[PDB]
Amino acid sequence: SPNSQYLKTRILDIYTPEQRAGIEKSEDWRQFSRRMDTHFPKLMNELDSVYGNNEALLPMLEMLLAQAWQSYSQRNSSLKDIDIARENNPDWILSNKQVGGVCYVDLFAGDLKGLKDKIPYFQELGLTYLHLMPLFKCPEGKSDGGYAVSSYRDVNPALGTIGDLREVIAALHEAGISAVVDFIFNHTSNEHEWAQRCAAGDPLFDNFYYIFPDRRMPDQYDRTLREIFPDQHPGGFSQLEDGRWVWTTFNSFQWDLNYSNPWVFRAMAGEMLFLANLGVDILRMDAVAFIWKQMGTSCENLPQAHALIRAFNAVMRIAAPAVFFKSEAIVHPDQVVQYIGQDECQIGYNPLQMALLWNTLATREVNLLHQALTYRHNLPEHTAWVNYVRSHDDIGWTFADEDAAYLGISGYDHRQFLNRFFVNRFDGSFARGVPFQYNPSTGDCRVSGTAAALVGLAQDDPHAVDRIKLLYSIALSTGGLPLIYLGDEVGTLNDDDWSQDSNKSDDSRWAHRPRYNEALYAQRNDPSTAAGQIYQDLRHMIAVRQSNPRFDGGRLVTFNTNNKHIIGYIRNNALLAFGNFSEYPQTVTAHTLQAMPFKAHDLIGGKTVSLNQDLTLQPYQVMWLEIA
Numbered sequence: 001s002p003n004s005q006y007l008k009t010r011i012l013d014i015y016t017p018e019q020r021a022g023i024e025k026s027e028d029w030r031q032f033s034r035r036m037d038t039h040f041p042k043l044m045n046e047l048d049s050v051y052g053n054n055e056a057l058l059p060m061l062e063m064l065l066a067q068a069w070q071s072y073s074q075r076n077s078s079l080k081d082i083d084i085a086r087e088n089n090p091d092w093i094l095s096n097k098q099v100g101g102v103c104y105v106d107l108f109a110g111d112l113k114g115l116k117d118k119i120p121y122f123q124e125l126g127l128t129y130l131h132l133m134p135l136f137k138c139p140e141g142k143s144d145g146g147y148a149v150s151s152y153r154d155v156n157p158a159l160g161t162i163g164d165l166r167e168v169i170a171a172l173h174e175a176g177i178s179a180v181v182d183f184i185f186n187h188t189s190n191e192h193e194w195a196q197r198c199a200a201g202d203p204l205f206d207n208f209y210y211i212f213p214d215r216r217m218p219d220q221y222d223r224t225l226r227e228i229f230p231d232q233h234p235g236g237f238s239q240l241e242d243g244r245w246v247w248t249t250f251n252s253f254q255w256d257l258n259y260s261n262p263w264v265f266r267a268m269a270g271e272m273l274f275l276a277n278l279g280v281d282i283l284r285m286d287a288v289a290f291i292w293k294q295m296g297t298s299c300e301n302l303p304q305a306h307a308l309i310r311a312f313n314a315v316m317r318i319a320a321p322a323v324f325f326k327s328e329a330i331v332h333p334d335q336v337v338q339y340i341g342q343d344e345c346q347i348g349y350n351p352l353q354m355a356l357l358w359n360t361l362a363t364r365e366v367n368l369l370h371q372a373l374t375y376r377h378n379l380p381e382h383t384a385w386v387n388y389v390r391s392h393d394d395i396g397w398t399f400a401d402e403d404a405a406y407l408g409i410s411g412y413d414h415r416q417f418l419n420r421f422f423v424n425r426f427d428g429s430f431a432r433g434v435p436f437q438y439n440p441s442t443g444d445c446r447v448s449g450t451a452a453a454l455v456g457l458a459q460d461d462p463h464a465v466d467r468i469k470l471l472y473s474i475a476l477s478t479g480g481l482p483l484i485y486l487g488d489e490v491g492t493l494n495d496d497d498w499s500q501d502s503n504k505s506d507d508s509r510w511a512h513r514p515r516y517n518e519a520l521y522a523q524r525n526d527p528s529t530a531a532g533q534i535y536q537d538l539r540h541m542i543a544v545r546q547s548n549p550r551f552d553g554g555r556l557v558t559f560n561t562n563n564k565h566i567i568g569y570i571r572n573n574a575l576l577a578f579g580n581f582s583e584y585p586q587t588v589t590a591h592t593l594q595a596m597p598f599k600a601h602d603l604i605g606g607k608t609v610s611l612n613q614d615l616t617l618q619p620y621q622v623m624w625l626e627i628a
């Protein structure tokens, strides 16, 4: 294997002697050279574990590094300052000051210029992080909400131009808001040039995807492949018009990229640099679990997948230190955590917590949630969870069967219950969700619907508003970077048109992808409306979180409340949080509280509370007691 010094000398070989001398003394080169020495060993090691003695590895590597230098050289000075800042503050992601939001540019603000006009609102809300959904060119009609990319460089014309995106990102930074976008690296649309040329037989794009002559191998692979959208097609393959079959983990119009080919990594790494230089702060690593395939395995979470992401991580450490990764791994808890590491994905969605928040609202029992916060919350140094209540996707019950077994709970039976409850097919349910991907051959099913629709706000359940505050209070205080599904802060309901839109009717996820509700946002300052109540509540908690140091970091210690309906935890040994998931008053006995100070101030309600006597919480009430 070649070393950093060797490769760097060859990188400089493109310059004339006179030029070279100049570069070798430049500041940019000094920084690039230093990072090369520090991080290249990791990049080489990761790529070697995956590609081994592949003849294309060395050539691809040198091509990628030359590209990395040009990219870093061209990188804007202001971005380089951020590189230096984060390179020296790896825990910026763990700060209590961070609070994020996510929205579709078209649905929330019309277009990019329109989104720029919303920035003042984002500041009003207190956001320091904004994830904008898929912005680039995609097939018209059906594109999986933009996740079927036809071009990584050309902005969706309906949203604006690449120039508009640059301005948006610049304006976000001016507003103290990091920009977060998707890095859809597991697949492209079947209309992407690479796909067309690969399928057409262009030798330059040979093996850029997985294409088979017939069902022989597809049938063998399908013996162990999980179905993500069984509604769209069985197994993981789709048939071409010419009869061949291509790997399509998701929709038929989304073709899985072939990372067993070194040139594919190089291609995507080039796309990462492009995004990096636009000023992106965090890249949402879409479908990280699926980037490596191996006959006989589930083709998820394989070793090479992790190795590749660590390789990608190394490239940013070298050519754009400010760019961090957000892992999207909605899988088994044991698998979810493996993507999180300073050298892999510094942060990642925490589906376990999100899933259990909803579970607890249904069962009124915090057992599973307590278990999770107790044994699966804390993370390695320099990494953090992205805690959320809802997302652009359905809700999957990804808790661990093994964990549930410890508590005497049957995973399969429990999910059947949860599914029925949230789609209003259970007596007394307050939820008004919609089914998503019911798989007849497995019994699995997910749930679609907005936070408000799932808590009963559609029918005006008097407990709806409090349930929302409760769910969000936990994502906001357990430790990690909280993410607000923009629209939830005013109690936005489901979209009542998607079911009849032929481009959406077969994807119930559009039920919880409503447009900006002008009427609800116009009520956010009125305490008599649900929108105002929800808004002022969330805004208050956001304010408290960002200003109070007791919330800093991502570590927590659970507290036994001795009440199966009340969750309890302590942050920094100074903030004691209680959450009542029962629609009835619930009590934490004075006996249970004997070790606590006699009185404590509650940041939620603002009152001083007595802990030397039974503490009775109102239905769905949450308390943030300062115990130190």
Ligand SMILES: OC[C@H]1O[C@@](CO)(O[C@H]2O[C@H](CO)[C@@H](O)[C@H](O)[C@H]2O)[C@@H](O)[C@@H]1O
Pocket (backbone or CB within 6 Å): 231, 434, 435, 436, 437, 438, 439, 505, 506, 507, 508, 509
């Ligand atoms: O249920 C309404 C509507 O949802 C769609 C689109 O996602 O399918 C979902 O619901 C069906 C019936 O409950 C499930 O069988 C299916 O698996 C699930 O995705 C539409 O097909 C249906 O009309």
